[model samples]
Structure formats: structure tokens, C-alpha cells
Target: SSPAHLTMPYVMPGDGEVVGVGEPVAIRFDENIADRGAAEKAIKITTNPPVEGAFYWLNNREVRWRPEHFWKPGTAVDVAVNTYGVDLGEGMFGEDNVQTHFTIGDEVIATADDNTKILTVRVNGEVVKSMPTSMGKDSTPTANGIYIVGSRYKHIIMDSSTYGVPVNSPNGYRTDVDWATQISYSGVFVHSAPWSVGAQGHTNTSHGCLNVSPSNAQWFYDHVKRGDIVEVVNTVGGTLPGIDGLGDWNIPWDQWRAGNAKA
Candidate 1:
């Protein structure tokens, strides 16, 4: 048998793996597998008590795995990738097999309101925090759908160029913000937007940024640690009737599952 191939690190899925009910399971590809599909066939995964799971190629180096709906707690899940000397499609080959073992411990949940600009963080079906927020403008509305709190950063820089708006130009609606408590890179944030003080709670006028009160944001910032889910829902957007962005969340679990594919 050939030597084992390199694999990404895995945590034995514990309370940490308890994702929100509508949250999707995510798999992070390291610098090792930057090319999409280059190493997928070399990869084989199994979820104990198997539930239908799919891997989505989010970008060149990363992929996400999740069932149509959320993974049920206590479900045994396992993943195996045979990189051992296996060709990764372009004359590039994997050197060995990498396997990960873990289980889903519990369920997590959260909710976001695009209209009122508020996010309710929940755990085990319990509402823990209700924080005010600001959302994108009418012209460039934020993605109306369900999204998970995939990752986090203690501090981040919010640049104007993210939404295709130029920086420093009169037409460019831009500002450089520090201490951005980012939840999604899709231009949504649960960070502090002090400049919009007048509109923080009384209005929903932001350039797509989710504005949270400095103190409340700080409290939330210190607490509600990562892997804690965030949901953005309730918009007038037509993607869903009586709702918008989080419509992705309202979609039938099976239909949501249909959207998953290994890129």
C-alpha cells in the first residue's frame, strides 16, 4: 500500500459541531487542495447511520458538506479521502488517504430580520440574544435567504469595494471600518456602524451593512462565540413570498439539498 496522503485537520465533532437547525455543514479545504475537483474523486466520505450528504465546491480550495437540511444531533458522521498516490485529475496526484471521524452532537439555531435589521441568536431552540442591526440599502439589498455563521474574526476591515462601489470617489459610498464583527463575507455584517447613529434602530438605511449598537454589539461580540448560527430573513424581496433572503431557509429541506453539489 502507498503512503497516506495529506488531509485537513478535524475536530471530533462535539458540542462544537452542533450547528443551527437550518445551518449547512461546512468542510474547509486547506492550502493542500486549492484546485476544485482535483482531489474529489480521490475523496470518499461516509456518514454513519448515513444521511444524504453533498459536497459543494465553494471556491478553488474549499468545499462544504451538508445534507439537504441540517444534520440531526447524535448522528454519527465519518469522512474518508484517499489521497494516497491517487491522481487528482491534472497530472497532479494525491499521496495518501486521509480519514476523519466525528459525530453531530446537538442542534443550533438563529434568526435574522432583513426588514427590521435584527438578529436573534439561539441555542438548542432557545433565544439567547436579540440584537438590533442595519441592513443594505434598497438598491443593493443584501442576499435575502438563510446563511450560517460559517466563520468569524475578532476584527476585520470593511472596505467599500466589496459591493463594486469605488473607494474615495464622490459616487463611491465607502468607509473604512475597523473592529468589524463579520458573520458572512457576502457583504453582510453584524458589526458596529456608529456613523449611522441616527438610523441604527429607528431606520434601515445602510449600504448593505448590518448595523448593531456599539454596546450591544460589544456584548454580542464578547459572547455568542463562533459556530453559533445567524439567520437573515424577512425581506420584501420576491425570491420568497412574505419573505426574502432567508427564503433560502424556507425552501423545502429537500430542495435545499438539491442545491448541494461537489464543485
Candidate 2:
């Protein structure tokens, strides 16, 4: 029998819950897993009509699986973690297995082009809004690649010091902002920058954020959901790292599949 400390894993989005198209299925184990590769192989996901995705190790006790591309609307997903009797190394065995089923919601995608300085919004593959935007300047270019909107805020303080820029520096700033939607964990956001309206569609002058009009920003923040896609391109800067946020889309299907512990 497994040790008393062993227990069932915790699944995110809950059984029968509805999630966004880009949402990743997350699992948290009670015990600190040691053999992550073995554990990943023990899990299985069955989707309606099938889908390609990759499993990533967020930590020893946590792991997440995301589809290579955004899920199709109305798609069904089932997750099964066959951990019972499974060895997690160092006498920490899995005591029980877990399973859950969830449905995919709407498909939302926001594409931003640094060169054009515009953001094209789409829902279910239909273009909705094409708003002017201000991307990062030459010195600090916005990262290019696909990202998931992880969080949203009505208002927040933007501090350059948080990213290593001192307040007294020539390019440093700290101010309160509105309608900030976080796309990258590295501090890239599409937010209201009323102060940069003149430069929005004409020149890239931001410190790395995608700035837009207050009304437009508010509209975007209200429409976006967790796991919605935000693709940035044509930037002088390099692409964002997969670990930077919900950057699973940045990884090619083949490379992402290779990261699966089962491989």
C-alpha cells in the first residue's frame, strides 16, 4: 500500500468547467514528484476530434498541458492522471488517480504588428477591431511571438524599476496606468496610454508595452479572457521565451511534443 502522505492530484478548471480556447490544463500533486518524466507518461488526455498539444513541467509537484494551437470552439477535453500505484521516487508514491472533463469556450485572438503599429482583434476567426497602437521604441522593442493573456487589471502602477530600470535613469518611469492586460509574464501589456495617443499609430515610443487609447484599451480588457491569444510580430527585438508567460504557442508542435515526458 502507498504511504499515508500520498493523495490524489488536484486538477484545474474543475470537472465539467468551461475554459477558454488557449487555456492549459494544470495539475498539482500533494507530494513533490521526483520522476517527472515517469509521471508525465502516466497521464492521458482524450479530446473530441483529437488535438495536438504538449505537457510542460511547471515544477516537481505541478505540470500543465497546452494545445499546440488554440482549441476549437465547443471542443471537449478529458484528462486522466493515472498515478495510483505509480512511483514518484524516494518512497513518495501516488495513492490515487484523478480525472476531469471540460469544455472549450470562445476563440479570441489579438494580433499586434510593431512595424504597422496596429492591433487587429478577432473572435472566432472574424475580424472585430483594428485599433492603432504604440509598441516599444528602438531601444526597447516589444517581444515578438504568441502569448496568452494571463491577467487583467482596471488600473495599476507601471514601474520601470521592477524590470531593472532605475527611476532616475533617462529611460525610466513610474506611473499609474489604466486598463492593463498582461500578455507576457515578463511585463508586456496592452494598456491605456492616453499620453502616447499622438505617437500610437505613427511611431513606436513606449518602453516595451503596447499602448492604446483609453476607450480602446477598456474595450479590449473587457473582451479578453484568460488564455486568449496575443500574437506580436515584425519587431526588431527577438521572440519571447516559452517560459515568459503562457508562451506555449511560441514552441513549434514538433519541439513542444518532444518536451513531453513520454518522449
Candidate 3:
């Protein structure tokens, strides 16, 4: 049987999907790609206003592309992967060509100020909500930079070990947290932390996660969607690393453009 009969490539922000302006376009294949460069060359993206964007490989089977900044609200995007019987190396070939189109939805942004200990939420550039927030403590400060809300969870078991902190270490912790919104893959999250309510808006108290009141956390969890922007400023520690999540905005547009492979 041909590879096309067993598996296929898929594009996300699947056809007719609508996503936040901060969202990236992702494509995945059931089979591993051997020549990623070749696969990238075969993919095409068309934007209504012709935006500048770049692709980053997440793994052998997945890749993503995002604009240097958030996409303009209401932008239209079309993607095509012409990978039929294309060599993926090691006897694995591409299954079939895939295409998809998506629309950019409203701009949802959350700005957290470590200096003020406040979080201001905006939708379509308009202030919609404000809440007190507790950031990382002095010894373990939260990173400062723009990030995209990548995932959501009603409840989760947070283990410090996952991020290199031993369970028995003084700074380590493991617990069930509610209303978790993942802002970074490095274990940073906006989650409910009732124990830190007193310090919220007044002092920094968390290990590194952003802590909010349960009610406020619930509100944020319900309001935010994947690809929403989360900008943190004035962290004493430093800015978020470029690979720390969707910290893509940490790089200036010019620098991002210069690093583009397709340029």
C-alpha cells in the first residue's frame, strides 16, 4: 500500500477556522520528515496583506509559522502543503497534499506589570478587566516578555520536578492547581493561588508562576483563548528566552526577518 493510503499531512487552523491574531499556523504529518528543509520549501502561505512570517520546526513531524508580531485583526490566511509522494527520508514518503484557510479573530491581550502587581486585560485594544496578580519572588523572578496563551486546564497536577526542581528541594512543590492557563512551555502559568492572595497586587510571592485569586483566575480562564497575547513587563530577573514558549515577540521584527530561512 502507498503511504498516502495509510497516513496524511494535516494543517491547523484547519479550513474555515477562526483564531486569535497571536496564533501561529501549524502543520503536522503522521510520518516523520527526513528533509525538513525540503518540506518547508513545499509549503506555501498566502496572507491577504502579505505579512512577513517565519517557520520553526517543533519536531520531525510538526512545524509552525508565526508573524513577527501579532497578525492584524481580520487578516485572512491560506496554507498549502504540496507533499504528495515527497521523500520524507528513510523510506517514508509524504501521504497527500493538504490545504487550509483561517481567519484572524479579535485581539485579546493581557498585560501584567510586575512593578504595579496588576494585570490589565484588553479585547480589541479596549480595556475590559483588571485584576491583582502575584508574580515570582525575588529569588525566583518571573520572565518579562510577550507570550501567547497556548493551552488551558481546569485543574492540573503541577510538579516542580518537571522544570528541574527536585521534589525534595526547598523551592520545589507539587500540588493541584485550578484554572490553569499555560503561557509558556517552561512551566510558567497564570493560575489560581489562593494562598498568595495577600501578596497579590502588593508584593511578589510565587516561585515563578503568576498567581491570581480563584475568582479572578476563573474569569481569566473563561475569557482567554489559545493564541491570546500575554505581555509581562519589568521582571527583575530578565526577559523571556526566545525558545521559552511563544516568546517570538522577544526578537525585534527586523531581527526576526533577518533570521528567516526563506528570506
State every prediction's TM-score relative to the real structure: 0.68, 0.82, 0.84
The local distance difference test score of each candidate is: 0.55, 0.83, 0.83
| Models ranked on TM-score | 3, 2, 1
Q: Write the per-residue lDDT of candidate 1 for residues 1-263, one digit (tens) a residue.
A: 22223344332223324433444434444434544455655556676668776555444444555676666766665666656565544444454455666565445555667655667766567777787766766775555655544444556655568768787777765555534555555456667667776676456777665677777667666665434456566654433221222223445555544443432
> In candidate 2, which residue ranges exceed 4 Å CA deviation?
1-10, 14-17, 28-32, 58-61, 82-85, 94-100, 158-174, 260-263
Lowest lDDT sum, 10 consecutive residues, model 3, at: 254-263
Model 2: per-residue lDDT, tens digit, 1-263? 44444656887768987767878888888767777787787889889969877788655677788777778989899999898878766666777888999998789888998767889999989999988999988899998998888779999987889889998899888989899999887888999999999988889988899999999999999898777888899989898887664676777777766774542
Backbone Cα, N, C clashes tallied per candidate: 17, 0, 0
Q: How accurate is candidate 2 locally (lDDT)?
A: 0.83
* Top TM-score model: 3
CA deviation > 4 Å runs, candidate 3 = 1-10, 29-34, 58-61, 88-92, 160-173, 259-263
